[PDB]
Structures are given as C-alpha cells and as structure tokens.
Design a protein around this ligand. Structure first.
Ligand SMILES: [Mg+2]
Ligand SMILES: [Mg+2]
Ligand SMILES: [Mg+2]
Ligand SMILES: [Mg+2]
Ligand SMILES: [Mg+2]
Ligand SMILES: [Mg+2]
Ligand SMILES: [Mg+2]
Ligand SMILES: [Mg+2]
Ligand SMILES: [Mg+2]
Ligand SMILES: [Mg+2]
Ligand SMILES: [Mg+2]
Ligand SMILES: [Mg+2]
Ligand SMILES: [Mg+2]
Ligand SMILES: [Mg+2]
Ligand SMILES: [Mg+2]
Ligand SMILES: [Mg+2]
Ligand SMILES: [Mg+2]
Ligand SMILES: [Mg+2]
Ligand SMILES: [Mg+2]
Ligand SMILES: [Mg+2]
Ligand SMILES: [Mg+2]
Ligand SMILES: [Mg+2]
Ligand SMILES: [Mg+2]
Ligand SMILES: [Mg+2]
Ligand SMILES: [Mg+2]
Ligand SMILES: [Mg+2]
Ligand SMILES: [Mg+2]
Ligand SMILES: [Mg+2]
Ligand SMILES: [Mg+2]
Ligand SMILES: [Mg+2]
Ligand SMILES: [Mg+2]
Ligand SMILES: [Mg+2]
Ligand SMILES: [Zn+2]
Lengths: 105, 146, 58, 159, 205, 61
RNA sequence: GGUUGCGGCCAUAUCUACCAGAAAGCACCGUUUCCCGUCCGAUCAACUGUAGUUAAGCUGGUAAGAGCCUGACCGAGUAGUGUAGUGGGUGACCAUACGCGAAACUCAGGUGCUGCAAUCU
RNA sequence: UGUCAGGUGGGGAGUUUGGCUGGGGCGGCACAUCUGUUAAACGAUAACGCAGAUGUCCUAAGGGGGGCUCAUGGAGAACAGAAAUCUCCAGUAGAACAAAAGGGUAAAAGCCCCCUUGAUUUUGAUUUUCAGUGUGAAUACAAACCAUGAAAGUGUGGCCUAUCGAUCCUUUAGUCCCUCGGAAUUUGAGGCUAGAGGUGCCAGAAAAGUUACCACAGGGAUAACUGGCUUGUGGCAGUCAAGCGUUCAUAGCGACAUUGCUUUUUGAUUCUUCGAUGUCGGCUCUUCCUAUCAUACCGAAGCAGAAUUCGGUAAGCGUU
RNA sequence: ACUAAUCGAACCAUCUAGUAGCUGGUUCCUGCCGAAGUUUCCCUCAGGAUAGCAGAAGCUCGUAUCAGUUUUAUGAGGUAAAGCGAAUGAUUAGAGGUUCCGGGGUCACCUUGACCUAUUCUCAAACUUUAAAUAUGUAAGAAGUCCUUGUUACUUAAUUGAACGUGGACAUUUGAAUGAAGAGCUUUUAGUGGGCCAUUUUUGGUAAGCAGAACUGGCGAUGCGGGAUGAACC
C-alpha cells in the first residue's frame, strides 16, 4: 500500500487542537532495553537449575503485521499513532498512481 | 388445540360448557374439532343440565346451586334471581351471558348410558364418528350423559 | 464415537413451562440512546417547569 | 464451513420489487416521525446505511428517538424464555408508519363523536366492536328464482 | 453393469438438473423425440392417442429410448412410417446419482430420468382414424418397457392441437386456420388489422 | 385425568405463622389474628402479616 | 380548458407508426464584446427577442397496435395446503371429513390523475 | 587443584508427542469465518450435505463535486479487412463497480476531470454472533476540527454482506501528570490513558517417535468374530419380443428395457457381546432345505434310432 | 535371559488413605413438588463452566401489566403450487425471411449451415413475472382522548414545533372474544448437559431396526385396558 509522507489531520497538542500539517513515518518497536522489570524478573527466574522456565512461542500463523504510522505535527512537534490494516508491502510516499499514462515502452 | 380447550374450560373427558356463537368462537370450535362433540342445545337439554349438574363458581369453589338464594347472591346484580333466570340467560343469549355462563362450573358429565352409538368415536360425526358439529343430535347425546 | 449435533427438541416446551414474559413496560422510560442535544435541553425544560409549579402552587 | 454473516440468507429479502428499482421517492423523506409513533420495518436494498438486520424485517415497533436522517425504534425480541427490548437506529427509507395505528386513531375519534352525540340522549350506543354475529332469519322468494340444478356430472376423460 | 431401475423408480429427491454445479453429466440415450411423419400437416392426422402415466415416478432415459423404439418399429412394420407422427413428451432432465464406510457418500452422475406425475402424458401419436388399433397396439407394446401403470387414452382433440375436433373444424371452415410447418396458427381477434389481412388473406369472406 | 392448567397442591408461599418460637410473639399473633378476623379494619390484617416476617423483612426504623 | 415553472404518485404515464395544434407560453432559432467552457459558441456561458419557424421538441388524437393497469360465478373452489381417522392401496400414492385457497389461461374495460403559483382568444 | 564462562554431551534424567471423524490410522478441516442453496415463504436449524470463497488488495480502488453513459448490434469514412482512428442510430444495463457468491446502482454507486485526507479527536448508545459476556464487523448520534460543493447536503475508510486476536511480557504515543514509603535534585525504574509486536487448535499449553516385551482404568459410547436390518454388488427367477435359429420371435436362445426372489458372496450399519459366546481349514457324525447331478414316473424338441437338450412331480435314496 | 516359584528394572518398609474426567457400591418409612440429554465457551467430544428445565424460602400486593387461543385492522415472507408463445439457464420440432467466414454448384443455383421473425415439446435445490396454506410482527385506550396555556440553553423566519407539564371535560359497553387456575417479583440450590421412538416436512444413501435436521406428541421417568407376545402404537 502507498501512504504519503505528509498529512493534514487533527493535532490535539493543546496548542493546535485543530487540523494541522503532519509528517508521516513508520513506527519501529525499539530496543528491548534490559532493566525492564519483566526482563529483570525473567533473568532471575531463568538462572540456576530448572531449564526453560517460561513458554517460547513457535506456532506462528500470520505472514504480515499491522502498519503503525507516527504522525508528527510540523509546528508543535507532537506525535500521534495510526494503525492501518494488514498489508504485505508498504511504501511511504512512493510514485503516486497515474491514470492518463500511455502504455508505450 | 389443548390451549383452546383450556380457554373453553374443558379440562377432562366428558366435560361440557356453553359457548356463545360468534365468529371469534367458531374458529376456536373449528380448531378443537377432533376432540369435542358439539351441537345446538334444546331448552329441555339446558334445563336438565342446570338442574341435575348445575354448580356455581363462588370464591373459586364449586358449589351446588340447589337454592335460588345461592344464584341471587352472585348473579342478582345482573338481574338473575332464580335457577330459571340463569337458564333463561343461557337459552336466550342475553346481555349477561358471559357472566352467567362463567358462573356455571364446567359440567361434569358421565359416559353415555346407551353408549356413543358408533364403533369408533374419533372420526367426524359426518364420517360415522363422534366429534364435530352434530347440531341437533347433541341433545340425544348429552341427555344420555346427564 | 459420534453423538447428536443439535436439536431444538424440547426447547419450546422448556421455554413455555415458565410462561414467556413481555418486557414489563413502564411509564417514563429510560432516556438511554436518546439524542444528547434533545436530552441536554430536556434537563433545562424540566427544571423550569418544576420552578413554574413551585412558584405558583408553593 | 458454516456461514452466519450479517446479511446471510437475505437474497430475496433485500431485493427490490420488479420494475421498482432505482431512487427512493420523496414521500419517504417528507414523512414526519415522532417519539411514540408505531412504525413497520422493511429494509430497502438500495440504501445500505442505517439498514436493519434481517430479523427486524417485518417487525413493528415504537419510535423512541428521532435523529437527523434516522429513527430509533423499540422492538421486543424473544430470546430463550422471555422477550428482550431491542433498539435499532434505522434510516427513514427502511421504515414507514404502520397503518394499523391510524385506523385505531380514527376509531377513538369516532368513539368520542358517538359518545358526545349520546351525551344529550340515547345512552348505551355500543362503543365496543362486536364479532360477526350469526345471521338472522329471513324470507327468500322464488319469484324469478325457482330452484333448478343438476346432479353430480359423470366422469369424462377431458383429454 | 447398470443398476436395476427399482433403485431410482420413485421421486425421492429434489429435481437435480444438469447445470453449472455438475458439469459432468452423461448424455440421455433418447435424442430423437419426434418420429414418423413429423412434417405432416394438422389436417392429415386428426386422431390423437395418448400413453398416459398413472403414477408419480421416474422413467429413465434408457426406458424412454427402449419404449420409443418398440412403439415406432411396430407402427412402421404394420402401417408404414409415414402414417403417424410420434411425439414423446417427457424429457429426462433429472440426473440420477450413484455412490460407489458412508463417509463422503455424495454420488457421481449415473444417468438421466424423466420425472412424471399422475396423468402426465408420456407418448403422443397423431394419426388417421383408420389405424387407431395400430397405434393403440404400438403404445400397448411400449408399456412393457416402463415401470408403473400406464393407460392408453384416446384424445378428444384434433391431433396435437389444444382444440376439440368439432372446434378445429368450425375454425378451419373459416379462414381462422392457416397451415404452418408442422403445427398450425390460429386467428386472433386482437392485433393490427394490417397484420390480420396479410396473414389469413383467405379470411374476410 | 385432568388437563391441569396450574401446579397442583401448591402452598401459598406466604407465612401463615412466625417461624420464631418466641412465646410472647405467638401471643401477639394470637391477639391480632382475632382482631383481623373480628374487625374489618385493614390495619389489623397488615399488622398480623408483619408479625410473621423474618428479620431481614423488618429492618430497623 | 390550453401553457409555463416547481412537484406528488411513478407506464392507465412507456414504445412504434401517422396525423392535427388559434392565442399565449415553451421551443428551435439569430450573435460572440464581456464572465465562461471547448479540437469545434455542437454542448456549456453570455447578448439581443431582434432577422425567421411550428419543421422538430412539446401537447393531444388515431391503432380489432405491443406493453401496462383494473375487474370478472374466465379458468377454479382446480393445483396446493392446515387438521383427522385401527381410511383405501404391496407400494408409488390416492380418496373422504372440518377449513384456507392460488398462478397461468380466457374475456371485458381503460391508456394518466392531481397539488401550488403564474399566464392565455 | 578450586570457582566462573563457552562448546560438546540419548551416555544418562524428566517430560511431551492436538481435536473432529459412520472404529482407529491415512486423507481432509466440516477447528475462526464469508456467499448461495439444503432450510420446510418470521427467526433459528444438522451431516466429512451441495457449489464456492477468506488470512489479501487499495493515497485511491477513501471523501466531496462537476461533466458524461455502459455491454452489444447496425450503418458509414485512404491503406484497414471479422479489426487498429473518426461519425451517427438503437441500446433497462444484456456492462462496470479489487478479489467468491448474492443483493444494490444510469443527469449513478459505472467512466473522465477538479479539489482533497472524515482512513482525524473525545466519549457513551445501538445491531449481529450472544451468556444478551468478549473479539471482529457495522449503525445512528453528541462535542470538536476539517474536506468538498454555488448550496442544500455529504464524508468517523472501501456500495452492502468476510477479510481477524486476551492475560503476562516488551515497545511506542499522550499527560509532562502520580510513586520510588527518612528529605531533596538529576539519571534510572515503576504507574495511568491509547496503540503495536500473537497465539490460524483462531476465548489464545512451550512439545518427536516407537513398542510384535508391554501395563493400568475402562469402553460393547468403538473396530476385528457369530447373530439382527438392507441387498447396491454376488447369485437365482420372471415379463415384453427387435432379432438368431436355412425359412420360423417364443424347439432352443434372445437385444433394448423392466418386475422380482435369496441371504451360502462382498459391501453398508454398529443393535448385542470388551468382569472374554475359544477367531481358519480339515477329520468325524447327524439332521434339514431345493434353486434336481444321478435314480423313479412323465411332458416338449430343429425327439428316425442311439445320444442329447428343455420342462414337471419329486429331497425317498445316493453323490466317490 | 537370569538376578531365591518375583524381571522390558528384584524384594522389603515408608512417603501413601499417592491421583483417577474411569468401574463398582453408597443402609428407615410416608407425604408434596418434580426434570434433562439442549444454548455458548473450554487441549473441548466418557469432563466441566454457563443459560435453560426443577425444588425450597418466600416477599409486595389482591383480580390486575396477562394468555403455547380466536376475531378485527394493518404489516412482513418468496416455500407448495404455477411460468417458460415473460428475464437467466436448459430443451424438441418444423415454418417464413435474410447474407456475411457459411452449401461443390452464378463466373445465381428443388437437393442451404448459422442469424432474425412468428410458432411448438419439455424442465430448474443453488431460475423467475406471480404466489398460497400453515406459521409470524403490531394494535384494539385513564401511561387514553380533546380544549386552554407554562418551561427550555433544543428547534423555528417567527412559541413555529419538540418533549414534559398546570388547569378543565369524559366512567362501567372504558372502547373485540374466551379464560384467568391468584398476579407480579426476588434469592438460593439439586439433578441434567450419552438420548431414543411415532405422524408430517426433509438431507446423504440402492437401502437399512442406517446416518442427519424442522414442528409436535411420546418413551426415557409410566403403571392400567387393548394390539397373543413388544419402551414408544391405539
Ligand atoms: Mg547458570
Ligand atoms: Mg347398558
Ligand atoms: Mg368402540
Ligand atoms: Mg452430546
Ligand atoms: Mg450466507
Ligand atoms: Mg460503509
Ligand atoms: Mg435423497
Ligand atoms: Mg434433495
Ligand atoms: Mg449557438
Ligand atoms: Mg530419554
Ligand atoms: Mg428462513
Ligand atoms: Mg468506490
Ligand atoms: Mg526508602
Ligand atoms: Mg483451541
Ligand atoms: Mg477455541
Ligand atoms: Mg494448563
Ligand atoms: Mg446407532
Ligand atoms: Mg466362557
Ligand atoms: Mg423344484
Ligand atoms: Mg530397579
Ligand atoms: Mg480413599
Ligand atoms: Mg491407593
Ligand atoms: Mg405432579
Ligand atoms: Mg421451577
Ligand atoms: Mg426460501
Ligand atoms: Mg415448485
Ligand atoms: Mg425453487
Ligand atoms: Mg454424561
Ligand atoms: Mg436413563
Ligand atoms: Mg400382533
Ligand atoms: Mg400391551
Ligand atoms: Mg390418534
Ligand atoms: Zn500540533
């Protein structure tokens, strides 16, 4: 799917509270960042004898993930999250469709 | 049909009741036809029914009439003071037929003294059985069950 | 070991032994799902008429 | 396997009538609905928004809410051993006034007229409706109407 | 070889025609439905004899084909081929299934059968009055190839028309009747008069 | 056989007496039984029924 | 009553063929400077009601017209169907009793009605 | 040598090695869903019923407006034809609308052009599934901010009916708010609100085999045996008579069809038996049936005789 | 294989009364009431939770908001039937006209294929212009009807409406029939969650004392008279 890298949408930044121009980028998760309490709990429970103490997922079925867009307002630098449906291919602002093109070549 | 039989207060075999003939009651009769034998009662049939098996419904109790004051205490508001006043309201369907007929407990008849006159009851009276409208022959049937 | 899959047998006899009930209507039904703009004004309309009788009947 | 979608088994339910396709006429849009009106539900296949579920096709309810282009209707639905109140948001294309309410609203009007006429004189003017009565006795004459009819006909092949 | 016809005698299933949900049905063994003097005019053959079923059942296309040959061969051998027009009426449109555990038992197409009712005409023969016994015997010999009771019915209609013999004569006396290919066209009291003069010029006499 | 329209042999579902074995409450029920029967005042019939009630059915006033 | 504008129901209004139409209105028509749109003042826009024409549109009529609409003791109380029987029949199925009840078919009639405003020998 | 760290390690230990199912296994998914039909004209409704589809795709294929009208056919214009561009007439949709099927749509919901991001924010309410729980999907609003259009109006993704996902954990956005419990500051961490990372066995365990060495609790809820139902198939009969039989349908046969019988075949079912009815064959011995091989007496023949063939009464008596 | 009659991991004691959704058993009488084998979810299919069916405790009241029923009025449906000289898709047969790749045959053709026009035979679970029966929604009033005027920040060009009201009028024929066995309401908990049979409708199968659905009535849970005999039939 094709999504523009810019969008005019509602910014609830407490200074706009209206439709403003936004920049559009795709959300990536971020580093796991150990010293999270679950990771601290996981490391202690794994230590010593007993083996693998927690389940490990294998039965995966989806071949896609839902796309998350980060919508950063261009004047107050406030972000917003929007989730699209599952798609196998996602590009950002790439080569909009043309209808009057001649098939030539 | 079982619900309609309950609405006509015929909850056991050989029970009887009077029904005012309107359109709203004719499909009720048309809907319990395989289970009931009915027809048009004569004055002699009604008089012998009310005299011998006539019981009043007084405070949810089945009370034998046996006295005019019993009927007057309950139906005197509508003008019915006697057992023949009650009979008159039935044979000539009066303004207070609904109250007079409902005051009468459903008639508890016996089996016919000479039998049903048929080999098998559960065909129509036209088809040689017993159920259905047997219009003027109901007097012969009821008088042997009373 | 196969068994029965589905049947609505006896389900109407069961539903009728306790006599299927109508939803017991009331005067003054709940204003749930009524339009908020009407409901917001009806609050001010009922307040004013309550004051009108209060000012007169006292 | 099995399919139980929202509009399943509605192939003929939501069809338009023959030679009656196209745009909805303006009468449905000029009808005024108020809270308490009794309305019949019949979905229009041409209008896919505000469209009732296939259960409420042919059901009659009371208007509880009036909105911009839609109507809230109260329907009692039997679930298990009791009835449940249901609330639909339906565009006016899918509903119409049930004509049963209008004759009753004329009978109450005609009842008051008869009672007001009977107020001065002639009491007990039979306000209640009555069922069809058994026919009264009458005389039928044979002047120009002498009975003449044949018996049952014999069996012919006809082919 | 083939299953006996007693397995498919009765109309136990819904009508199951060849459609876009089978696409693998075999061919009916009866392909010719009009026999003898099928090009004859309505005036040639006034007498109509009907073989009429008296049962609600299914006649297979094989039984239809066998009886059609049995009736046609006798009528040609005894009275010549051009003395009769035999129109067999029922068409085998219903598809018979065969299953060949009970898991996945939905059957493959096995054959064709014609679903017939009580009083439905199976065979129609229009002839002259002189060979009434010939075609009656031809249909009587065709009964043995069918299951269930069939009756030989002498039609009171002029040939294959829907009109009684006196009714057809009364209309044919006037210009209300014109001969056509194998059937006839009748005069209507409706339509344009310009069409009603170019067709039936012999009328208006 | 009788086509029964309602459950047979059904108890009324109302207390005809207090479950309490207090002898003095039984004397109060005995007094107000007589009053409910020998007077037509609906007050006596209400009080007699209230004397039958359980503890949760008579909250403190 | 014709006509125009805005309509309601949406063929009794549609379709085909051929005829009529005073007055008014509608229309075709005449023009391209401006606003406007085109490859093309054909459409669309503007301008003058002037140079003209009822030819078309439109309206109405004509047709053993097609279609549509209405009704029918027309088919037919037929097909079907609810209820009943220790009814018939090997069966397939069928008949009867108490009720409800079609479609096709065949005939007969008809071919828009009407609301608001304006206008017309 | 001691401790920690990486590798190796069925030598050894512990555990696992779905479900539905005309027994189980294999196959499949009828396991979460959608369209039509079965489905018996409210709704609901089963089978490993029938015909198919879903885990996608789309910055337009979403939203608004304007202009236009499609499939096909006919008639015409240099190469150019059944046909490449232009023109007219007819055309109720026979086209098109992402993807299955159904429904819907003609100054549109289709085609082309112009503008655009309402595929946005904050909540409650409602419909379907339904326990009236969740999820998914959808409906009408309200309070904002916008898009479009002259305007009314429309728009809270796809014309409608499918296209999907808890707790724990991680992660992001928002508030820049709350806490780190002796008091502060700054890092760090933990909270609140709203999303994502995924469980397709789709209300969501982390999981390979084999046992012919086997065990236990049970199950006739369930197979392998006898018996019971049925008779497709197996076997044995019949009706018709196109033909064969040199000629002559029926001495003997007999096509195309069609009506049966039997339970010595094999299928199909799973009613009985799993606290067990001894599961093949043969030997031995008795009895029963007839659909008769022989024998007794007959009828028919394309019976000259002989020998044969067909048929009747007939199971008395034999059948190595 | 053998390892004290014990061997695919001996014997003895203890943990240990190990767990068991599985089998068996579960002890006095009488009285009253009295089921389910079905919904949804579950590593669920010999189990459980949930809703339903049932008992008990009652509570608030006292003939009603009512009803496995009809009538009247007004809706809805697309099955039985019907239809194919009506659409879609099949389908038999000739007629008439016609013109192009179609017929050797003018160099315009008795002995032609498509196509068009008017007819004709027969059909559809996944066809349809029509269209029942049975079944099904709603209404038949005091929470009603009518008149007058009060509130509002909603709404209107505007008290114009909307909703809720003040005050006034109407009564036992108060707005169909029949019935009502008291009516409404709550808490709590048992068992059950293997079903099977009959009529009618109906799927797969040649069929089945087969397998699977719909409505109802039954058996289970039930004796009695009858069908000699038999769970279901009368
Ligand atoms: Mg370690
Ligand atoms: Mg005697
Ligand atoms: Mg007897
Ligand atoms: Mg079960
Ligand atoms: Mg569906
Ligand atoms: Mg939408
Ligand atoms: Mg079948
Ligand atoms: Mg079928
Ligand atoms: Mg011009
Ligand atoms: Mg191991
Ligand atoms: Mg349905
Ligand atoms: Mg679109
Ligand atoms: Mg501290
Ligand atoms: Mg699972
Ligand atoms: Mg699950
Ligand atoms: Mg677990
Ligand atoms: Mg079984
Ligand atoms: Mg033994
Ligand atoms: Mg023999
Ligand atoms: Mg050991
Ligand atoms: Mg123990
Ligand atoms: Mg133990
Ligand atoms: Mg009892
Ligand atoms: Mg209970
Ligand atoms: Mg249907
Ligand atoms: Mg049909
Ligand atoms: Mg059909
Ligand atoms: Mg169990
Ligand atoms: Mg039991
Ligand atoms: Mg017997
Ligand atoms: Mg017995
Ligand atoms: Mg009976
Ligand atoms: Zn901002």
């Amino acid at each position: 799917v094709n999504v523009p890298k810019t969008r005019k949408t509602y910014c609830k930044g407490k200074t706009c509270r209206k439709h403003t121009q936004h920049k559009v980028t795709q959300y990536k998760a971020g580093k796991a960042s150990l010293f999270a309490q679950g990771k601290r709990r996981y490391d202690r429970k794994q230590s010593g004898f007993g083996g693998q103490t927690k389940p490990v997922f294998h039965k995966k079925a989806k071949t896609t993930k839902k796309v998350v867009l980060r919508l950063e307002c261009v004047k107050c630098k406030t972000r917003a999250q929007l989730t699209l449906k599952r798609c196998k291919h996602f590009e950002l602002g790439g080569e909009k469709k043309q209808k009057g093109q001649a098939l030539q070549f | 049909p079982r619900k309609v039989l309950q609405l006509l207060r015929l909850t056991r075999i050989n029970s009887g009741t009077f029904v005012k003939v309107t359109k709203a009651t004719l499909e009720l009769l048309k809907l319990i036809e395989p289970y009931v034998a009915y027809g048009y009662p004569s004055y002699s049939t009604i008089r012998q029914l009310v005299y011998k098996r006539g019981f009043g419904k007084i405070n949810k109790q089945r009370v034998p009439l046996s006295d005019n004051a019993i009927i007057e205490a309950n139906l005197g508001k509508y003008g019915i003071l006697s057992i023949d006043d009650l009979i008159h309201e039935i044979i000539t369907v009066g303004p207070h037929f609904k109250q007079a007929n409902n005051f009468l407990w459903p008639f508890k008849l016996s089996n016919p003294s000479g039998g049903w006159g048929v080999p098998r009851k559960f065909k129509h009276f036209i088809q040689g059985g017993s159920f259905g409208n047997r219009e003027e022959f109901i007097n012969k049937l009821v008088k042997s069950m009373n | 070991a196969k068994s029965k899959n589905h049947t609505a047998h006896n389900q109407t006899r069961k539903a009728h032994r306790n006599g299927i009930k109508k939803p017991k209507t009331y005067k003054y039904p709940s204003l749930k799902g009524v339009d908020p703009k009407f409901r917001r004004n009806h609050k001010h309309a009922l307040h004013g008429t309550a004051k009108a009788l209060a000012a007169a009947k006292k | 396997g099995k399919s139980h979608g929202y509009r399943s088994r509605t192939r003929y339910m939501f069809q338009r009538d023959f030679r009656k396709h196209g745009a909805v006429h303006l009468s449905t849009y000029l009808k005024v609905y108020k809270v308490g009106d009794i309305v019949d539900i019949k979905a229009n296949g041409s209008i896919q928004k505000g469209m009732p579920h296939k259960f409420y096709q042919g059901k009659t309810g009371v208007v509880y809410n009036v909105t911009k282009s839609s109507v809230g209707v109260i329907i009692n639905k039997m679930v298990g051993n009791r009835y449940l109140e249901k609330r639909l948001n339906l565009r006016v294309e899918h509903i119409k006034h049930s004509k049963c309410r209008q004759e009753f609203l004329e009978r109450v009007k005609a009842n008051a007229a008869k009672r007001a006429e009977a107020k001065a004189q002639g009491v007990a003017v039979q306000l209640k409706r009555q069922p069809a009565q058994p026919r009264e006795s009458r005389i039928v004459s044979t002047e120009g109407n002498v009975p003449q009819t044949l018996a049952p006909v014999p069996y012919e092949t006809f082919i | 070889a083939r299953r006996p016809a007693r397995c498919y005698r009765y109309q136990k299933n819904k009508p199951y025609p060849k459609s876009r949900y089978n696409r693998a049905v075999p061919d009916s063994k009866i392909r010719i439905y009009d026999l003898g003097k099928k090009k004859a005019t309505v005036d040639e053959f006034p007498l109509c004899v009907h073989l009429v079923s008296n049962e609600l059942e299914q006649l297979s296309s094989e039984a239809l084909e066998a009886a059609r040959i049995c009736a046609n061969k006798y009528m040609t051998t005894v009275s010549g081929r051009d003395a009769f027009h035999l129109r067999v009426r029922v068409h085998p449109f219903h598809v018979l299934r065969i299953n060949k555990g009970m898991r996945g038992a939905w059957g493959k197409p096995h054959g064709l059968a014609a679903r017939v009712d009580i009083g439905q005409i199976i065979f129609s023969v229009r002839t002259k009055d002189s060979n009434k016994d010939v075609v009656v015997e031809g249909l009587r010999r065709a009964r043995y190839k069918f299951p269930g009771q069939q009756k030989i019915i002498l039609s009171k209609k002029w040939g294959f028309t829907n009109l009684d013999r006196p009714e057809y004569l009364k209309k044919r006396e006037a210009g209300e009747v014109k001969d056509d290919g194998a059937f006839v066209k009748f005069l209507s009291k409706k339509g344009s008069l310009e069409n009603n003069i170019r067709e039936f010029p012999e009328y208006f006499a | 056989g009788i086509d029964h329209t309602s459950k047979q042999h059904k108890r009324s579902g109302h207390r005809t007496a207090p479950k309490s074995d207090n002898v003095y409450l039984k004397l109060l029920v005995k007094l107000y039984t007589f009053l409910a029967r020998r007077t037509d005042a609906p007050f006596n019939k209400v009080v007699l029924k209230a004397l039958f009630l359980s503890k949760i059915n008579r909250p403190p006033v």
